[PDB]
Design a protein around this ligand. Sequence first.
Ligand code: CL
Length: 291
Amino acid sequence: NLYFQGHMVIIDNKHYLFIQKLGEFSYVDLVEGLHDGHFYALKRILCHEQQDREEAQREADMHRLFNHPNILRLVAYCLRERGAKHEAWLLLPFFKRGTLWNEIERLKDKGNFLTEDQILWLLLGICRGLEAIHAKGYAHRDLKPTNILLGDEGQPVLMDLGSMNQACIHVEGSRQALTLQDWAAQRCTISYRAPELFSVQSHCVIDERTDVWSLGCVLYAMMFGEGPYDMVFQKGDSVALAVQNQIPQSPRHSSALWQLLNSMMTVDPHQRPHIPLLLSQLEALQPPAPG
Ligand SMILES: [Cl-]
């Protein structure tokens, strides 16, 4: 009567207490570490084939490529089975503020938006995260506001590295173009997907500037309360066509910020900037930390 029931797991010899389901192929659970008091998000991936163990290894490995404040770290990885049930587990830090998306809905539901100083700090954090990814030779490939957590100091943190791959891809011939086009149709949220990945051309080079387009959409989302192709998506018409055609000057935004958004959302990737240039442009605006 003085004891109480609980459900727990052991990971790397440490006991974690189930608290609640956080969300979702995979579940995510809120758990509490009983050694240290801290909270974690335990992502559990269901395996039916060897490929599934392999895909989860891959993701775990992407996380441990980096030790950067704007990139979600991996606390532990493991494999668990019981009878026929087989799972792979990624233990991760818990961000009580949730995602950048639900912060920009919270405001848009009261009629407000993020201020320009808030926008500039967030954007700086996201670019520095990407810069670290690009410098190692990868691209994220599924950047969007629901893949961006907000830390306890308000810092933005990138998550979901299960579509990350080599940054540079040479497409030669229709067969390679089409296999790439199908891969993106699978792994790159359609309304945040770069133009060059619809109708992949037979001879071309797809590089990490793919992420700079997606980042432009995230910026747009922060500035207008929705993604630039969400009404199109939600009203059933063709995103692929909208994305291949081509922002308002709402006087809550400096033209400097408006120029940043325009440059990111250029359709020809050859005319689109790389992250190091964007950071140079951003840091000259001398963005303030929150406080
Ligand atoms: Cl085994």
